[PDB]
Design a protein around this nucleic acid. Structure first.
Ligand SMILES: [Mg+2]
Lengths: 547, 400
DNA sequence: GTCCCTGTTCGGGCGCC
DNA sequence: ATGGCGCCCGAACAGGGACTG
């Protein structure tokens, strides 16, 4: 029927009015499906007939439901949504089965005719006109229908939740997961109390969508009594993938990484750079062909998750793969994963593996607070000494919650360390770079305290690139130990962060040199202040491109 | 009973639309309990998605107590809300910070403005969509709450300020700052006397706050590296103190020398260094507090539990430069230390200038937003941005 | 001021319900 | 057609440092 719940007052945006769009032709099979629905809805008071006194109109269409038998009536309210007010969405996330606690009895039931059972604001029904009826209930394709149904459902369940605080009801759209610590027979009674409570508010629960035995179909999973699994994921077997086919592959792999450990999508996602066409085809690289093959081998293996025990602690263990990728597993008992995941977001032009580990810990922590409301204890592949070295010398405030080291390679380490004091017996290089804004010409070079001088001319460069080119030049022409003095806090700040990877090949070449060195000391002096021998190198690189 | 005061927003701006961040189970359970009690007493009312405004919310458990306090991050709404400081407060021996936030729940709020005070209570694992509320009375943490209640606040503290003229009672947001020159012991007796005075309706020491001046190294033997680090530090300090000169020191580096080469300081160069030290002792000239501008606060992590900070409004025009020390152990939390550091700096600005500073925090944005609520303890929240600080200002205020 | 570099937020595409 | 969340990417922004005469 129609819910006797109060309607949600909805207004339009100021200075705007209803939509006025005509209807497009449709197939006879779709016209039959609509007249079979509109005539029955009109008798249920869900849609009311109008006349010439309603200048508004909106085109409609119909598609096949998940059951592939009944027709879902969709309206193209794309013009009404532009002129409809803004709502605050109440659906703050997606429930995950790893956050479900163990219950003795579980029921998964859906509400029949969700939108079409919740009344619509009377003053707003004018704009919902279509050729002629108008919606008296929540229509599909409207901006406010999801938020209004989700809030109305919460209003309806509120008396039942207050009366039954120990029955857990996972409410997502019209689907209801109901768990209880009661015996099977006493649980069935509580379900009927819930079905009678919903029916009181005009919400029906047809038996066709009333699951009573495991495995329950819920949110794309299969809920068993002591475990859960994800519905099968078929990867598109093709020969020449396109831009749209790669997203379908990566999007499914990301969905699979929630329970399948070891999923990587770096090189696959890297192939979508610079493209501007959805149907564009791209030659698949060889490093991505190996990445897709090993992903396929994991999905062939079976895997499943467990449920959350509040009495036990949460444990998250992170492994490391190449290309700056990370995989994690959250469990409470060894080799009984509640959930898995992956992290591979490149943050920053320059970074190392300790930053990336810190970022993965933060992502997992926030993710764990959503699902379980608490923070997990970590198992990180980094030595306590390596972490103490980093956070003591790093200028930013960084921190990792309670964790423990695990001897599972590849270990996370810093590939080089800058000296704190100048190196005795090491040649002192005074580097500097300069570039011209107009001609884009520049010169990088150095001056040593032993008489050596070199100046390298550069074309199509910037002032900051010449400073890095000078440091790179000193590293190339020095021994295993070297002192470098630069006037560039840009280049100093980059190198002092101890990066091991960069979007810049110039920095990558600098990183490769710094790992070969045994001792490096980098100092900073102000530019254009007569300090030697920064004054000597400044005159060399400025000759011909400045003043 | 009491009529409301009509309040509107600033011209050309809409209300806040800020997403709620994830909350732990203990915070959500505390918020649900507090909200149900506030809803029963008519302080807040449920609302739906037809309200397009939102403002974050969380809770904090103060010290060793079984009581939680609800905290609404209303600083985004305060910036959009329509618009003498006691100079003697910073010169009191002891200052107690009282929370009079409960007093705002007696005055109703303008109905047309309630739509902007909306907040959402999340659920664990998204069992339930967000359950939204709005305020019916003066909300805690809002700029308008102390202003509308200012008339009623003075009428309560008037018999206490009269009988205690040597006591300075200042109000900022939900807090009431009470300072005195009384002996420690009699001071608490008076604070309890004021607490009893407030129940008829319904520990700082600013005298010991110090400044951390810029200090130069003192050595018996100087190298080219030591002098280069000194010239660069003086070259920066001369931007704050125009009397700093570095001519005689920089000429000792004339040439292309090794960093470890020992340089003997000349008479004129060592005179220049001794004169530069006396300049750093002098206070900065031409620094006048502008109440119409924001207070900028930079913080540098010096390591080993050391934290330096500078409060200013114009570049190189520091109103105060202090330092903050803490634990020197291995069980140190940078985020916990930084959160305590911003609460001390903010509390000083409220006592000194009665204004909150805009912090430039040297922390990754995600690192801060993940844990900063776990250590917060104040009823207010200052504005902040996240900096990728130069490794230079860390060296300039670094102690030796 | 302009020009460079870097970090964040934004709305596209796909995936999931 | 709509809403949520996720991932990835590239546009637009803001904030800071170095530079010309
Ligand atoms: Mg230079």
């Amino acid at each position: 029927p129609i819910s006797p719940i109060e309607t949600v007052p909805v207004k339009l945006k100021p200075g705007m009015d209803g939509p006025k769009v005509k209807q497009w032709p449709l197939t006879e099979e779709k016209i039959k499906a609509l007249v079979e629905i509109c005539t029955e809805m009109e008798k249920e008071g869900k849609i009311s007939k109008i006349g010439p006194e309603n200048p508004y109109n909106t085109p409609v269409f119909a598609i096949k439901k998940k059951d592939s038998t009944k027709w879902r009536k969709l309206v193209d309210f794309r013009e009404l949504n532009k002129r409809t007010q803004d709502f605050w969405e109440v659906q703050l996330g997606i429930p995950h089965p790893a956050g479900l606690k163990k219950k003795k009895s579980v029921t998964v039931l859906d509400v029949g005719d969700a939108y079409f059972s919740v009344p619509l604001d009377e003053d707003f029904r004018k704009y919902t006109a279509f050729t002629r009826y108008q919606y008296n209930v929540l229509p599909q394709g409207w901006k406010g229908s999801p938020a209004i149904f989700q809030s109305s459902m919460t209003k309806i369940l509120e008396p039942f939740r207050k009366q039954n605080p120990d029955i857990v009801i996972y409410q997502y759209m019209d689907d209801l997961y109901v768990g209880s610590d009661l015996e099977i027979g006493q649980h069935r009674t509580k379900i009927e109390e819930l079905r009678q409570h919903l029916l009181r508010w005009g919400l029906t629960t047809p038996d066709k969508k009333h699951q009573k035995e495991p495995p329950f179909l819920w949110m794309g999973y299969e809920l068993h009594p002591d475990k859960w699994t994800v519905q099968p994921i078929v990867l598109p077997e093709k020969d020449s993938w396109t831009v749209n086919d790669i997203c379908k592959l990566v999007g499914k792999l990301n969905w699979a990484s929630q329970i399948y450990p070891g999923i990587k999508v770096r090189q696959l996602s890297k192939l979508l750079r610079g493209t501007k066409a959805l149907t564009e085809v791209i030659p698949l690289t060889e490093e991505a062909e190996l990445e897709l093959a090993e992903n396929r081998e994991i999905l062939k293996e079976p895997v499943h998750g467990v449920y959350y025990d509040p009495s036990k602690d949460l444990i998250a263990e992170i492994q490391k793969q190449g290309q700056g990728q990370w995989t994690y597993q959250i469990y409470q008992e060894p080799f009984k994963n509640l959930k898995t995941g992956k992290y591979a977001r490149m943050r920053g032009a320059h970074t190392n593996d300790v930053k990336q580990l810190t970022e993965a810990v933060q992502k997992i922590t926030t993710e764990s607070i959503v699902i379980w409301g608490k923070t997990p204890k970590f198992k990180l592949p980094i030595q306590k000494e390596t972490w103490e070295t980093w956070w003591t010398e790093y200028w930013q405030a960084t921190w990792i919650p309670e964790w423990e080291f695990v001897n599972t390679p590849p270990l996370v380490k810093l590939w080089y360390q800058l000296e704190k004091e100048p190196i005795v017996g090491a040649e002192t290089f005074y580097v500097d770079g300069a570039a011209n804004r107009e001609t884009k010409l520049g010169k990088a070079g150095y001056v040593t305290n032993r008489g050596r001088q070199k100046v390298v001319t550069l074309t199509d460069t910037t002032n900051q690139k010449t400073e890095l080119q000078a440091i790179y030049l000193a590293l190339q022409d020095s021994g295993l130990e070297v002192n470098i003095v630069t006037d560039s806090q840009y280049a100093l700040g980059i190198i002092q962060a101890q990066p091991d990877q960069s979007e810049s090949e110039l920095v990558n070449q600098i990183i490769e040199q710094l790992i070969k060195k045994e001792k490096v000391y980098l100092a900073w002096v102000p530019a254009h202040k007569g300090i030697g021998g920064n004054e000597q190198v400044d005159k060399l690189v400025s000759a011909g491109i400045r003043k | 009973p009491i009529e409301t005061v009509p309040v509107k927003l600033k011209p050309g701006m809409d209300g806040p639309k800020v997403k709620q961040w994830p909350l732990t189970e203990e915070k959500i359970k505390a918020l649900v309990e507090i909200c149900t009690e506030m809803e029963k007493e008519g302080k807040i009312s449920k609302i739906g998605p037809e309200n397009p405004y939102n403002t974050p919310v969380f809770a904090i458990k103060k010290k060793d107590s079984t009581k939680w306090r609800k905290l609404v991050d209303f600083r985004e709404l305060n910036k959009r809300t329509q618009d003498p400081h006691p100079a003697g407060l910073k010169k009191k021996k002891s200052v107690t910070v009282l929370d009079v936030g409960d007093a705002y729940f007696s005055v109703p709020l303008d109905e047309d403005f309630r739509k902007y005070t909306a907040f959402t209570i999340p659920s664990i694992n998204n069992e339930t969509p967000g359950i939204r509320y709005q305020y019916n009375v003066l909300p805690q943490g809002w700029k308008g709450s102390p202003a509308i209640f200012q008339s009623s606040m003075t009428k309560i503290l008037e018999p206490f300020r009269k009988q205690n003229p040597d006591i300075v009672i200042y109000q900022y947001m939900d807090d009431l700052y009470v300072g005195s020159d009384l002996e420690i012991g009699q001071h608490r007796t008076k604070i309890e006397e004021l607490r009893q005075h407030l129940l008829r309706w319904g520990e700082l020491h600013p005298d010991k706050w110090t400044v951390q001046p810029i200090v130069l190294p003192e050595k018996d033997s100087w190298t080219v590296n030591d002098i280069q680090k000194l010239v660069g530090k003086l070259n920066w300090a001369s931007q704050i103190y125009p009397g700093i000169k570095v001519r005689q020191l920089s000429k000792l580096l004339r040439g292309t020398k090794a960093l470890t080469e020992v340089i003997p300081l000349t008479e004129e160069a060592e005179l220049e260094l001794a004169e530069n030290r006396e300049i750093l002792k002098e206070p900065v000239h031409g620094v006048y507090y502008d109440p119409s501008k924001d207070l900028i606060a930079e913080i540098q992590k010096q390591g080993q539990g050391q934290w330096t900070y500078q409060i200013y409004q114009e570049p190189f025009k520091n109103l105060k430069t202090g330092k903050y020390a803490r634990m020197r152990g291995a069980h140190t939390n940078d985020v916990k230390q930084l959160t305590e550091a911003v609460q001390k700096i903010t509390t000083e600005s409220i006592v000194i200038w009665g204004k909150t500073p805009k912090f430039k925090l040297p922390i990754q944005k995600e690192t801060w937003e993940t844990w900063w609520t776990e250590y917060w303890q104040a009823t207010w929240i200052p504005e902040w941005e996240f900096v990728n600080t130069p490794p230079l200002v860390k060296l300039w205020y670094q102690l030796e």
